[PDB]
Amino acid sequence: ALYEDPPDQKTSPSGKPATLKICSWNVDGLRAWIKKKGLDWVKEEAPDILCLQETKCSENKLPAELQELPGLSHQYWSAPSDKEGYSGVGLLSRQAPLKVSYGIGDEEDQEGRVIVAEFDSFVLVTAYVPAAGRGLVRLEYRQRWDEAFRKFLKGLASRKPLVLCGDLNVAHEEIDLRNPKGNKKNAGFTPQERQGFGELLQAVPLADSFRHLYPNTPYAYTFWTYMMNARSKNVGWRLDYFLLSHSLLPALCDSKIRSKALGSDHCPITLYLAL
DNA sequence: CGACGGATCC
DNA sequence: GCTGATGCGC
DNA sequence: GGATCCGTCGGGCGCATCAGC
Ligand SMILES: [Mn+2]
């Protein structure tokens, strides 16, 4: 069935106005996304912080239009050194973070999948979680990564609340995809990946912003295969999320799914926080 | 990975 | 330099 | 015999490399 994202709630339950707007987007090729007007959408969204996944671009090859974003002047980029054309993440911010780091401490490594940015009141992590792959060939690798990432996130020294955003490459529950029964042995909906997501939420711990606000909302997806007109039919998956520390729930105004924004097989997601 | 063909279930 | 084929990853 | 289950197959897109010219 079709989905219409509710209007933006820019006010906290306590009545406090949103001060921070973060947008996350798997762009499926930064260079292609820009030619498809992605930055025009970003300018209309006007987010304080933009997190990008699947840039598939080294920093030297970033289009010049990225240097014409004065509201997002502080840019940090990480691509895999040995996997040119794959993965790659970026974080763009209005204000400079206090600290920026890359990776999850111990990987293999320039994997181009994780950026950690410390701000005054919170730590932001953006991630492009490794896919299990066609035929589940990288499922065990994913399981090992999930555990390492869970430990890294829990073991952050900062006693600052955490915001984790990006493509977590898993639809947590049946409500998170149109075809749950046919996808239980497909990447993104394996019991192993779903269990990893649940373990992530309990260990750090973390809460799913969108599901916290919309626990029984179906048909809300952030990804549709380019194949078989899946996007027109709304046959999709919710793989993109904003996960928050419990301390940040009073500050939660809204978690949006920008279903109409084009440029990728993923749609962007937007978080409003009253800090 | 959604579409589809074929089996299985009440 | 540019196009199209192929390979890889989804 | 409609509903459900499950296994199989062909395809959208981006980027890298290569071959030809
Ligand atoms: Mn992708």
Residue numbers in the entry: 43 to 150, 152 to 318
Study authors write:
AP sites are then processed by apurinic/apyrimidinic endonuclease 1 (APE1), which cleaves the phosphodiester DNA backbone at the 5′ end of the AP site using its endonuclease activity. Upon binding an AP site, APE1 flips the AP site out of the DNA double helix and into an extrahelical position within the compact APE1 active site. In the human APE1 substrate complex, N174 is within hydrogen bonding distance of N212 and the AP site bridging oxygen (O5) and deoxyribose sugar oxygen (O4). To assess the role of N174 during APE1 catalysis, we rationally designed four mutations of N174: N174A, N174D, N174Q, and N174K.
We next crystallized APE1N174A with the same AP DNA in the presence of MnCl2, promoting APE1 cleavage of the AP site. From these crystals, we obtained a 1.97 Å structure of the APE1N174A mutant product complex in the P1 space group. Within the active site of the APE1N174A product complex, there is clear density for the cleaved DNA backbone and bound Mn2+. We overlayed the APE1N174A mutant product complex with the APE1WT product complex and observed similar active site conformations (RMSD = 0.208 of 2449 atoms). An exception was active site residue N212, which was positioned differently in the APE1N174A mutant compared to APE1WT. In the APE1N174A mutant, N212 fails to make this rotameric shift and remains in the same position as in the substrate structure. Hydrogen bonding is absent in the APE1N174A mutant, resulting in a 1.6 Å shift of the 5′ phosphate terminus away from residue N174A compared to WT. In the APE1N174A mutant, residue 174 cannot act as a steric barrier due to its reduced side chain length, resulting in a shift of over 2 Å away from the active site metal ion. In APE1WT, the 3′ hydroxyl is 2.1 Å from its metal cofactor, but this distance increases to 4.4 Å in the APE1N174A mutant. This finding indicates that in APE1WT, the side chain size of N174 acts as a steric barrier that, along with hydrogen bonding, properly positions the AP site within the APE1 active site for cleavage.
